[PDB]
Design an enzyme around this catalytic site. Structure first.
Site, PDB file in Angstrom:
ATOM      1  N   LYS A 102      41.917  36.977  24.570  1.00 18.64           N
ATOM      2  CA  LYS A 102      41.220  37.065  23.290  1.00 18.64           C
ATOM      3  C   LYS A 102      39.748  37.375  23.490  1.00 18.64           C
ATOM      4  CE  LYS A 102      41.437  32.024  23.303  1.00 18.64           C
ATOM      5  NZ  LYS A 102      41.903  30.819  22.561  1.00 18.64           N
ATOM      6  N   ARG A 122      39.984  35.783  14.520  1.00 24.46           N
ATOM      7  CA  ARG A 122      40.634  36.740  15.411  1.00 24.46           C
ATOM      8  C   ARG A 122      42.138  36.791  15.175  1.00 24.46           C
ATOM      9  NH1 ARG A 122      37.811  34.415  20.842  1.00 24.46           N
ATOM     10  NH2 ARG A 122      38.263  32.527  19.630  1.00 24.46           N
ATOM     11  N   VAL A 163      49.644  27.692  26.296  1.00 25.68           N
ATOM     12  CA  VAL A 163      50.002  26.280  26.183  1.00 25.68           C
ATOM     13  C   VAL A 163      51.172  26.175  25.208  1.00 25.68           C
ATOM     14  CG1 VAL A 163      49.223  23.973  25.580  1.00 25.68           C
ATOM     15  CG2 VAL A 163      47.646  25.578  26.682  1.00 25.68           C
ATOM     16  N   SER A 190       5.613  29.612  26.469  1.00 25.25           N
ATOM     17  CA  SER A 190       4.379  29.123  25.874  1.00 25.25           C
ATOM     18  C   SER A 190       4.690  28.469  24.537  1.00 25.25           C
ATOM     19  CB  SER A 190       3.362  30.254  25.697  1.00 25.25           C
ATOM     20  OG  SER A 190       3.603  30.966  24.494  1.00 25.25           O
ATOM     21  N   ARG A 241      -4.640  42.555   7.597  1.00 25.08           N
ATOM     22  CA  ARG A 241      -4.795  41.290   8.302  1.00 25.08           C
ATOM     23  C   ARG A 241      -5.987  40.528   7.747  1.00 25.08           C
ATOM     24  NH1 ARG A 241      -2.503  37.431  10.061  1.00 25.08           N
ATOM     25  NH2 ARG A 241      -2.705  36.582  12.179  1.00 25.08           N
ATOM     26  N   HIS A 276      11.361  31.245  11.661  1.00 21.80           N
ATOM     27  CA  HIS A 276      11.445  29.825  11.356  1.00 21.80           C
ATOM     28  C   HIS A 276      12.778  29.256  11.828  1.00 21.80           C
ATOM     29  CE1 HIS A 276       8.126  29.269   8.074  1.00 21.80           C
ATOM     30  NE2 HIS A 276       7.687  29.931   9.129  1.00 21.80           N
ATOM     31  N   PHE A 324       9.963  29.595 -13.639  1.00 17.70           N
ATOM     32  CA  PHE A 324       9.409  30.942 -13.744  1.00 17.70           C
ATOM     33  C   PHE A 324       9.521  31.617 -12.384  1.00 17.70           C
ATOM     34  CE2 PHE A 324       7.185  28.096 -16.655  1.00 17.70           C
ATOM     35  CZ  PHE A 324       7.418  28.712 -17.869  1.00 17.70           C
ATOM     36  N   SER A 348       9.974  39.733  -7.597  1.00 13.17           N
ATOM     37  CA  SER A 348       9.806  39.776  -6.151  1.00 13.17           C
ATOM     38  C   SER A 348       8.507  39.060  -5.801  1.00 13.17           C
ATOM     39  CB  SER A 348       9.828  41.225  -5.645  1.00 13.17           C
ATOM     40  OG  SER A 348       8.613  41.889  -5.948  1.00 13.17           O
TER      41      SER A 348
HETATM   42  C1  LIG Z   1       0.176  22.331  19.810  1.00 10.05           C
HETATM   43  C2  LIG Z   1      -1.053  23.139  19.993  1.00 10.05           C
HETATM   44  C3  LIG Z   1      -2.050  22.833  18.809  1.00 10.05           C
HETATM   45  C4  LIG Z   1      -1.711  22.747  21.320  1.00 10.05           C
HETATM   46  O1  LIG Z   1      -0.731  22.772  22.285  1.00 10.05           O
HETATM   47  P1  LIG Z   1      -1.010  23.531  23.717  1.00 10.05           P
HETATM   48  O2  LIG Z   1       0.315  23.647  24.465  1.00 10.05           O
HETATM   49  O3  LIG Z   1      -1.567  24.919  23.490  1.00 10.05           O
HETATM   50  O4  LIG Z   1      -2.117  22.658  24.608  1.00 10.05           O
HETATM   51  P2  LIG Z   1      -1.732  21.245  25.431  1.00 10.05           P
HETATM   52  O5  LIG Z   1      -1.607  20.111  24.458  1.00 10.05           O
HETATM   53  O6  LIG Z   1      -2.842  20.947  26.394  1.00 10.05           O
HETATM   54  O7  LIG Z   1      -0.271  21.410  26.224  1.00 10.05           O
HETATM   55  C5  LIG Z   1      -0.216  22.053  27.472  1.00 10.05           C
HETATM   56  C6  LIG Z   1       0.351  21.074  28.528  1.00 10.05           C
HETATM   57  O8  LIG Z   1      -0.357  21.378  29.845  1.00 10.05           O
HETATM   58  C7  LIG Z   1      -0.987  20.217  30.310  1.00 10.05           C
HETATM   59  N1  LIG Z   1      -2.159  20.536  31.078  1.00 10.05           N
HETATM   60  C8  LIG Z   1      -3.323  20.987  30.662  1.00 10.05           C
HETATM   61  N2  LIG Z   1      -4.111  21.152  31.702  1.00 10.05           N
HETATM   62  C9  LIG Z   1      -3.422  20.802  32.820  1.00 10.05           C
HETATM   63  C10 LIG Z   1      -3.675  20.746  34.200  1.00 10.05           C
HETATM   64  N3  LIG Z   1      -4.919  21.125  34.689  1.00 10.05           N
HETATM   65  N4  LIG Z   1      -2.768  20.346  35.033  1.00 10.05           N
HETATM   66  C11 LIG Z   1      -1.574  19.982  34.596  1.00 10.05           C
HETATM   67  N5  LIG Z   1      -1.294  20.017  33.322  1.00 10.05           N
HETATM   68  C12 LIG Z   1      -2.183  20.416  32.417  1.00 10.05           C
HETATM   69  C13 LIG Z   1      -1.278  19.418  29.063  1.00 10.05           C
HETATM   70  O9  LIG Z   1      -1.258  18.007  29.409  1.00 10.05           O
HETATM   71  C14 LIG Z   1       0.124  19.813  28.209  1.00 10.05           C
HETATM   72  O10 LIG Z   1       1.162  18.996  28.720  1.00 10.05           O
HETATM   73  P3  LIG Z   1       2.436  18.573  27.769  1.00 10.05           P
HETATM   74  O11 LIG Z   1       2.018  17.490  26.794  1.00 10.05           O
HETATM   75  O12 LIG Z   1       3.573  18.046  28.630  1.00 10.05           O
HETATM   76  O13 LIG Z   1       2.938  19.795  27.000  1.00 10.05           O
HETATM   77  C15 LIG Z   1      -0.641  24.602  20.060  1.00 10.05           C
HETATM   78  O14 LIG Z   1       0.538  24.689  20.791  1.00 10.05           O
HETATM   79  C16 LIG Z   1      -0.373  25.246  18.654  1.00 10.05           C
HETATM   80  O15 LIG Z   1      -1.267  25.528  17.942  1.00 10.05           O
HETATM   81  N6  LIG Z   1       1.023  25.526  18.228  1.00 10.05           N
HETATM   82  C17 LIG Z   1       1.245  26.153  16.903  1.00 10.05           C
HETATM   83  C18 LIG Z   1       2.487  25.599  16.206  1.00 10.05           C
HETATM   84  C19 LIG Z   1       2.486  25.769  14.689  1.00 10.05           C
HETATM   85  O16 LIG Z   1       2.073  24.908  14.009  1.00 10.05           O
HETATM   86  N7  LIG Z   1       2.989  27.038  14.069  1.00 10.05           N
HETATM   87  C20 LIG Z   1       2.957  27.179  12.604  1.00 10.05           C
HETATM   88  C21 LIG Z   1       1.471  27.072  12.120  1.00 10.05           C
HETATM   89  S1  LIG Z   1       1.020  28.520  11.089  1.00 10.05           S
HETATM   90  C22 LIG Z   1       0.674  29.967  12.172  1.00 10.05           C
HETATM   91  O17 LIG Z   1       0.198  29.798  13.246  1.00 10.05           O
HETATM   92  C23 LIG Z   1       1.010  31.404  11.679  1.00 10.05           C
HETATM   93  C24 LIG Z   1      -0.272  32.262  11.394  1.00 10.05           C
HETATM   94  O18 LIG Z   1      -0.373  33.247  12.330  1.00 10.05           O
HETATM   95  C25 LIG Z   1      -0.162  32.886   9.982  1.00 10.05           C
HETATM   96  C26 LIG Z   1      -0.589  34.380   9.929  1.00 10.05           C
HETATM   97  O19 LIG Z   1      -1.454  34.820  10.725  1.00 10.05           O
HETATM   98  O20 LIG Z   1      -0.063  35.149   9.080  1.00 10.05           O
HETATM   99  C27 LIG Z   1      -1.488  31.386  11.446  1.00 10.05           C
HETATM  100  O21 LIG Z   1      -2.138  31.274  12.495  1.00 10.05           O
HETATM  101  O22 LIG Z   1      -1.839  30.770  10.437  1.00 10.05           O
HETATM  102  N1  LIG Z   2      46.541  28.819  25.094  1.00 11.91           N
HETATM  103  C1  LIG Z   2      47.160  29.110  23.924  1.00 11.91           C
HETATM  104  N2  LIG Z   2      48.468  28.825  23.738  1.00 11.91           N
HETATM  105  C2  LIG Z   2      49.096  29.107  22.581  1.00 11.91           C
HETATM  106  N3  LIG Z   2      48.493  29.687  21.527  1.00 11.91           N
HETATM  107  C3  LIG Z   2      47.181  30.029  21.574  1.00 11.91           C
HETATM  108  C4  LIG Z   2      46.427  29.750  22.806  1.00 11.91           C
HETATM  109  N4  LIG Z   2      45.170  30.176  22.592  1.00 11.91           N
HETATM  110  C5  LIG Z   2      45.121  30.683  21.334  1.00 11.91           C
HETATM  111  N5  LIG Z   2      46.317  30.591  20.724  1.00 11.91           N
HETATM  112  C6  LIG Z   2      46.620  31.056  19.345  1.00 11.91           C
HETATM  113  O1  LIG Z   2      45.415  31.479  18.697  1.00 11.91           O
HETATM  114  C7  LIG Z   2      45.387  31.030  17.338  1.00 11.91           C
HETATM  115  C8  LIG Z   2      44.012  30.485  16.977  1.00 11.91           C
HETATM  116  O2  LIG Z   2      43.306  31.416  16.162  1.00 11.91           O
HETATM  117  P1  LIG Z   2      41.975  30.941  15.391  1.00 11.91           P
HETATM  118  O3  LIG Z   2      41.328  29.862  16.224  1.00 11.91           O
HETATM  119  O4  LIG Z   2      42.320  30.645  13.950  1.00 11.91           O
HETATM  120  O5  LIG Z   2      41.056  32.258  15.456  1.00 11.91           O
HETATM  121  P2  LIG Z   2      39.463  32.181  15.230  1.00 11.91           P
HETATM  122  O6  LIG Z   2      38.966  31.314  16.363  1.00 11.91           O
HETATM  123  O7  LIG Z   2      39.032  33.623  15.326  1.00 11.91           O
HETATM  124  O8  LIG Z   2      39.312  31.564  13.860  1.00 11.91           O
HETATM  125  C9  LIG Z   2      46.435  29.940  17.199  1.00 11.91           C
HETATM  126  O9  LIG Z   2      47.329  30.255  16.129  1.00 11.91           O
HETATM  127  C10 LIG Z   2      47.180  29.911  18.517  1.00 11.91           C
HETATM  128  O10 LIG Z   2      48.579  30.108  18.289  1.00 11.91           O
END
Ligand SMILES: CC(C)(COP(=O)(O)OP(=O)(O)OC[C@H]1O[C@@H](n2cnc3c(N)ncnc32)[C@H](O)[C@@H]1OP(=O)(O)O)[C@@H](O)C(=O)NCCC(=O)NCCSC(=O)C[C@@](O)(CC(=O)O)C(=O)O
Ligand SMILES: Nc1ncnc2c1ncn2[C@@H]1O[C@H](COP(=O)(O)OP(=O)(O)O)[C@@H](O)[C@H]1O
Ligand SMILES: CC(=O)SCCNC(=O)CCNC(=O)[C@H](O)C(C)(C)COP(=O)(O)OP(=O)(O)OC[C@H]1O[C@@H](n2cnc3c(N)ncnc32)[C@H](O)[C@@H]1OP(=O)(O)O
Ligand SMILES: CC(=O)SCCNC(=O)CCNC(=O)[C@H](O)C(C)(C)COP(=O)(O)OP(=O)(O)OC[C@H]1O[C@@H](n2cnc3c(N)ncnc32)[C@H](O)[C@@H]1OP(=O)(O)O
Ligand SMILES: CC(=O)SCCNC(=O)CCNC(=O)[C@H](O)C(C)(C)COP(=O)(O)OP(=O)(O)OC[C@H]1O[C@@H](n2cnc3c(N)ncnc32)[C@H](O)[C@@H]1OP(=O)(O)O
Ligand SMILES: O=C([O-])CC(=O)C(=O)O
Ligand SMILES: O=C([O-])CC(=O)C(=O)O
EC number: 2.3.3.8
Lengths: 1037, 181, 92
Positions: free
Chosen positions: A57, A65, A110, A259, A378, A698, A723, A727
């Protein structure tokens, strides 16, 4: 982001990692069939094929399937060989999507009866995990939500066997209640241990010999890879049917997983002519709908997004990948590249656009000969620089690039692209003017933006009370309150920050995805924190559910993970929401308005800010709950908060694809719980026009059922009384119409526009704009630390090493800024070698040893030794050089020079040794002298010094050329005899003390060696004997 | 003076400035001798609230490495017989770059680990001799001797440019003196 | 000009709290130099003002002076005095 794994990978993981008391059968018992492999190799490593019957399969994430006749049941090895040929490598059409068949799976047949056809399913929900068990499973399973027994297992709750036996084993045969239940428990233990989100077993057949799995559909949480990379191994996520994945998608996925920034790329149609550079998942989705509404769905090539503030290199790599992707095939009408996006909150437009222009410069040729036209819109931090650099890159490369700013409605560029328009308990209130927050992690830019927002909002105190960074000690970080300087405490531990600041009620968790969970769990132990904002993106769904469960128990309001935060104009701002201060003032977010909005996206929240500011009074409060599957707070929390809030007058809701969340809005409005006007729009209609199951940027932008489509939500809200614009283009117009209708009845009374307090411009910002002058207090010309590559006086370090320079060449570059010949560098190295050390009896080595035996330091001991380098010790190099240079320039004969220096009373520098006089020279003077004869072109000063030496030797045998004198005269000869220097340059370098530096650098090696020797020998503190001091103190003073 | 200027520059060579060499060498040597895997080492460093010495650059992350870490790394690969600690540090670098792209092996950390390898993977030294030389500060001396060339070059450059006496601007200093003591 | 008019905003890279050279009179941690010489505090008082930013009592300042007195010198055989003598005999 839940990604579906193949049947082969799912059964491999199940066989390897399940722990059941039941005798699991057919462990590691399967075969992979692909068109591009040989056949016998599949035989000798799979001896079971001839032992029992076979079934074949296609394993390419294809369902139904058996109903579509894609499975061959009860066929022998020759039978399956004959069965593959009419289908292997052929074209098929499932549902709406068509594609090839590059994967097949072979398993033993089986022999099972219908009575043992069991249906099992475990799928994750917000409140826990649903387990569906049906006794009459298989093809005749029929309805599952109405017939199959359902069991809920809550978050951090174990599934004990007896609950399964009672609630899930009613219609099953009795003789197999125990083992099957154990299997279920084991399967359940398999589920959360590897962070599976969906695990569907049908058919499942149990016989007296054991249990058998036939088909399983598995979706696993990819974001939990850093927790299961050991257990998953090299796990692969197959694309949906008819997607024909490409290696550049894998490269972009690796870059995203490398990253914290998000980089999504999916190739919908490589032959398409429309390509997108739109930042953010919500911006990407709305751009896709805008393109598809104009009929460009068939010509749309890729769906892409870059968020999380991608750096220079990440953006450059993504741009070069898409540019190489769009270069493959040539389209007669040309190609369109759309660099769109919302008004960025914290994504640096300058750096991302610099990466983009670098990629354009690297691929300008193919872009020019492909007739590729670029339209850019931008906004955000430093958007002026991005727009301008786009302008000059387009002008220089000749590519037609049309850039636009905030004034464009984010969708005009799409219309200009396709030729449609001409080109020109939880609390009701969370934040207030007295809200104090603690920031987790060093985010000085975000905290400074918050402080500026507070200042322009006329707040009495800054909204940031303390900062938390576990990797440094407690201190004070310097910030600006308007123009005045303030200090915000920074603590190593959260407990100290909570103790010293009991007035803090908000946490803004800037911890990464690997640390957000633990930080939030620790913060929730403190009752003073009522609101927590999680910024990190990529948190595993199960950990987020754990956070939601604990928050619900504790009553803490979680602003869902992977968000920019939220804004309450006049009261509080979370993190980087609303962009810089310029975007705050432009959108007038310094005073409250009357419209309150909730959105999934972060940049689209800023777009909503701009739209509400332009069309209505303003924003009262705006919240971005994040793009994750399970946000900490859903739409109900914030909409009910606004409804209970008398300050607001109208609500705006901007949802996305997937999730029956707006139906909750409809049901709330049904009995009149929500009375204030609501304008809701659900982006993601473009998913209806795609012949695939593309996963948007997302994590929660995935519609599982058919009622979670954007069109269905929009329609239902339309008859619900909401409302709903036609679009996203008409969202501003409908919002403006609603605002005018509400203000015409006296509901809204706009306030007077009081000017906000003035904040001085940043000095770096003024320098970037070229607005001010500040003279530089320093001047350097030897090394360039800044830039992509380290530079030594004009020569890059890679060029330094390729030219096979040594210590002499680097010394020449750093000290003289000259490209010295090879013999000059070797002579400098020899001079450093001969002056390396001369024993411990000298003053400098003595001082170094004294400081080392005190157990002080390497630097301190070297320093104490080097500080004796002066006139009496170590200055004979420069003194001899100056002496002989003056004598040679004066033009006097060596005999006259010797007689003059005898009469005047100064010793001739560089002449005179103690024991080595004749027939036994210094023998390191001989080495350098021989090198100078062999390699130096002209040595006039050396000859003059040798004549002086010959004259002085006739006086006494010991008056010979010393190492110092020889080095000085040969160094002067090198300076004023090689073409690198003129006479003035050589004279200046001799005067300023180049030979002093030569001697100090040479003797530093010996001094450090002396320190290391004293440390190795473990010598104690030295005190000079009293018998060698001879105190001569006065009688009495 | 030349000696005085070089001396005042060298006196700043310590824990915060120029100490990442010996600190990174000691950290990686202790991690390798403890027998813990690189992932366990990274987790232990994170739990203790300590940044991994010798890991992390400001701009150079990937597709644009240090251009001087690369030269030393290539030389060590080509010429050094065996480099266990270098491989351990490179695994740690892989993990850290999986965390954040610019968490690469610094020139300080690379020199430290490669110098430890050169010390204890050549026939000249026994293990205890290499440990003692690392302890007493051989890499501190290496950094001081290397940077002495640059400091003397800076002194000569300032002398040739005939720069006058420096006085730090008053606008760059925050006076937080008490009201009246 | 832009700093006097307050158009720009540049963070200060240094912080000090012991002495204020600017102004019409030298200040030792809040106390003017003339006032420093009025209440007749000596080496101890100036040392306390510069190191601790405190108005130490008279006995504390005198005790600090005595501590400086007794640690002034303890012969040339010690390591520091020996190094000073070695560097001096080099005429540096
Ligand atoms: C979270 C953070 C703030 C900061 O985190 P970072 O990872 O950067 O920094 P760190 O916290 O230091 O992590 C690094 C690790 O390395 C370790 N370390 C450092 N030095 C070390 C050394 N020397 N030796 C060993 N280790 C070391 C440190 O200990 C850590 O360890 P760990 O805790 O284990 O991880 C950053 O990620 C961030 O902002 N995320 C964004 C997520 C988010 O909200 N998205 C949606 C928001 S809307 C958007 O954005 C869209 C748009 O674009 C809209 C448009 O434009 O249309 C716009 O902008 O609005
Ligand atoms: N090892 C097997 N022995 C006997 N029949 C099997 C075996 N493997 C698959 N089949 C057959 O395949 C079918 C399962 O299809 P199904 O899981 O509904 O398809 P999908 O996963 O695409 O939804 C069962 O009817 C079964 O008879
Ligand atoms: C880093 C290095 O390599 S060390 C470089 C030091 N540079 C110098 O040469 C400084 C001047 N010369 C010196 O001091 C020699 O190094 C020394 C140490 C050998 C001279 O020390 P002395 O013990 O005086 O040597 P010696 O006893 O043989 O000298 C005796 C006579 O030679 C004369 N003399 C000694 N050095 C020199 C010289 N460089 N030039 C001319 N005459 C000299 C003395 O005036 C003395 O005079 P006298 O005839 O009236 O007695
Ligand atoms: C700042 C200060 O006051 S020093 C404070 C040091 N810190 C401590 O007190 C911690 C513990 N202290 C100690 O280590 C010990 O108690 C000491 C060093 C103070 C006592 O000294 P000892 O350990 O007996 O060694 P000591 O210094 O006496 O040296 C031995 C002899 O050499 C003689 N001697 C001392 N210095 C010299 C010198 N420069 N040249 C020749 N002989 C010397 C001493 O007279 C002494 O004679 P003694 O043994 O007959 O008394
Ligand atoms: C211990 C002592 O008193 S120093 C003894 C020095 N004695 C001598 O060398 C005598 C020779 N005389 C001279 O060279 C001169 O007459 C000086 C240096 C003594 C007098 O100083 P000037 O030459 O006027 O320059 P000055 O030191 O005032 O500095 C110039 C300006 O920069 C300002 N300035 C000084 N330090 C700083 C600083 N750190 N940041 C910003 N501005 C500063 C001063 O206010 C001065 O402006 P003003 O004249 O409006 O007050
Ligand atoms: O230290 C050296 O190079 C030798 C020296 O000066 C001396 O003659 O005593
Ligand atoms: O006593 C002191 O002042 C310190 C000192 O010189 C010593 O004994 O080593």
């Amino acid at each position: 982001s839940a990604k579906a794994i193949s049947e082969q990978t799912g059964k491999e993981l199940l066989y390897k990692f399940i722990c059941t008391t039941s005798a699991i059968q057919n462990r590691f018992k399967y075969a992979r069939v692909t068109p591009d492999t040989d056949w016998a190799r599949l035989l000798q490593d799979h001896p079971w094929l001839l032992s029992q019957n076979l079934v074949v399969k296609p394993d390419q994430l294809i369902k139904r399937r058996g109903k579509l006749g894609l499975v061959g049941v009860n066929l022998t090895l020759d039978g399956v060989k004959s069965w593959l040929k009419p289908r292997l490598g052929q074209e098929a059409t499932v549902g709406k999507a068509t594609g090839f068949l590059k994967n097949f799976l072979i398993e033993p047949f089986v022999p099972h009866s219908q009575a043992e056809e069991f249906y099992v399913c475990i799928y994750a929900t917000r409140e826990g995990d649903y387990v569906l068990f049906h006794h009459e499973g298989g093809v005749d399973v029929g309805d599952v939500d109405a017939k199959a027994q359902k069991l809920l297992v809550g978050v951090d709750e174990k599934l004990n066997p007896e609950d399964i036996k009672k609630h899930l084993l009613v219609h099953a045969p009795e003789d197999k209640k125990e083992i099957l239940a154990s299997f279920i428990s084991g399967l359940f233990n398999f589920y959360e241990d590897l962070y599976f989100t969906y695990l569907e077993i049908n058919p499942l057949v149990v016989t007296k010999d054991g249990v058998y799995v036939l088909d399983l559909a598995a979706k696993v949480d990819a974001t939990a890879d850093y927790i299961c990379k050991v257990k998953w191994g090299d796990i692969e996520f197959p694309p949906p049917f008819g997607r024909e994945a490409y290696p550049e998608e894998a490269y972009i996925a690796d870059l995203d997983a490398k990253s914290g920034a998000s980089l999504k790329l999916t190739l919908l149609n490589p032959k398409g002519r429309i390509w997108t550079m739109v930042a953010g998942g919500g911006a990407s989705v709305v751009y896709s709908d805008t393109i598809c509404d104009l009929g460009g769905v068939n010509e749309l090539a890729n769906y892409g997004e870059y968020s999380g503030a991608p750096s220079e290199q990440q953006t450059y790599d993504y741009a070069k990948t898409i540019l190489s992707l769009m270069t493959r095939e040539k389209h007669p009408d040309g190609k369109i590249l759309i660099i769109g996006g919302s008004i960025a909150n914290f994504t640096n437009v300058a750096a991302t656009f610099k990466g983009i222009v670098r990629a354009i410069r690297d691929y300008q040729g193919p872009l020019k000969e492909h007739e590729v036209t670029i339209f850019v819109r931008r906004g955000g931090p430093n958007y002026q620089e991005g727009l301008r650099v786009m302008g000059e890159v387009g002008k220089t490369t000749g590519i037609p690039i049309h850039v636009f700013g905030t004034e464009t409605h984010m969708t005009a560029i799409v219309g200009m692209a396709l030729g449609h328009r001409p080109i020109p308990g939880k609390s009701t209130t969370l934040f207030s003017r007295h809200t104090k927050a603690i920031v987790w992690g060093m985010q000085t830019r975000a905290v400074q933006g918050m402080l500026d927002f507070d200042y322009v909002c006329s707040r009495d105190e800054p909204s940031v009370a303390a900062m938390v960074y576990p990797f440094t000690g407690d201190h004070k970080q310097k910030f600006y309150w308007g123009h005045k300087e303030i200090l915000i405490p920074v603590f190593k531990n959260m407990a100290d920050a909570m103790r010293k600041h009991p007035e803090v009620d908000v946490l803004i968790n800037f911890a990464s995805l690997r640390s957000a969970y633990d930080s939030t769990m620790e913060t929730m132990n403190y009752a003073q924190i009522r609101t927590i904002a999680i910024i990190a993106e990529g948190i595993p769904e199960a950990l987020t559910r754990k956070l939601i469960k604990k928050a619900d128990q504790k009553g803490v309001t979680i602003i869902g993970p992977a968000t920019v935060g939220g804004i309450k104009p006049g009261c509080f701002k979370i993190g980087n929401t609303g962009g810089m201060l310029d975007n705050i003032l432009a959108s007038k977010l310094y005073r409250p308005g009357s419209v309150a909005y909730v959105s999934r996206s972060g940049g689209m929240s800023n777009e909503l800010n701009n739209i509400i500011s332009r069309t209505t009074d303003g924003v009262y409060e705006g919240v971005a709950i994040g793009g994750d599957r399970y946000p900490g707070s859903t739409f109900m929390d914030h909409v009910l908060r606004y409804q209970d809030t008398p300050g607001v007058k109208m609500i705006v809701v901007l949802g996305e694809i997937g999730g029956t969340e707006e139906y909750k809005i409809c049901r709330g409005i049904k009995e009149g719980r929500l009375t204030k006007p609501i304008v809701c729009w659900c982006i993601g209609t473009c998913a209806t026009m795609f012949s695939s199951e593309v996963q948007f940027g997302h994590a929660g932008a995935c519609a599982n059922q058919a009622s979670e489509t954007a069109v269905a939500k929009n329609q239902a809200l339309k008859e619900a009384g909401v409302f709903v614009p036609r679009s996203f283009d008409e969202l501003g117009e409908i919002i403006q119409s609603v605002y005018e209708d509400l203000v015409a009845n006296g509901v809204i009374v706009p306030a007077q526009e009081v000017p906000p307090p003035t904040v001085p411009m940043d000095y770096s910002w003024a320098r970037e704009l070229g607005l001010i002058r500040k003279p530089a207090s320093f001047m350097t010309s030897i090394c360039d630390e800044r830039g992509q590559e380290l530079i030594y006086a004009g020569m890059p370090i890679t060029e330094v090493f390729k030219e096979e320079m040594g210590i002499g060449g680097v010394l020449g570059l750093l000290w003289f800024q000259k490209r010295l010949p090879k013999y000059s560098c070797q002579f400098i190295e020899m001079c450093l070698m001969v002056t390396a050390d001369h024993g411990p009896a000298v003053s400098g080595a003595h001082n170094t040893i004294i400081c080392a035996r005190a157990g002080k330091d390497l630097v301190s001991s070297l320093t104490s030794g080097l500080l004796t380098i002066g006139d009496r010790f170590g200055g004979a190099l420069d003194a001899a050089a100056k002496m002989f240079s003056k004598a040679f320039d004066s033009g006097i004969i060596p005999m006259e020079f010797v007689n003059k220096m005898k009469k005047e009373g100064k010793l001739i520098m560089g002449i005179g040794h103690r024991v080595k006089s004749i027939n036994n020279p210094d023998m390191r003077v001989q080495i350098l002298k021989d090198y100078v004869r062999q390699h130096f072109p002209a040595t006039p000063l050396l000859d003059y010094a040798l004549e002086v030496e010959k004259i002085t030797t006739s006086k006494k045998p010991n008056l010979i050329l010393n190492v110092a004198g020889l080095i000085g005269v040969a160094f002067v000869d090198m300076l004023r005899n090689c073409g690198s220097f003129t006479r003035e340059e050589a004279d200046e370098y001799i005067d300023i003390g180049a030979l002093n530096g030569i001697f100090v650098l040479g003797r530093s090696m010996g001094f450090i060696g002396h320190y290391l020797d004293q440390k190795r020998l473990k010598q104690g503190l030295y005190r000079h004997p009293w018998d060698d001091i001879s105190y001569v103190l006065p009688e009495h003073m």
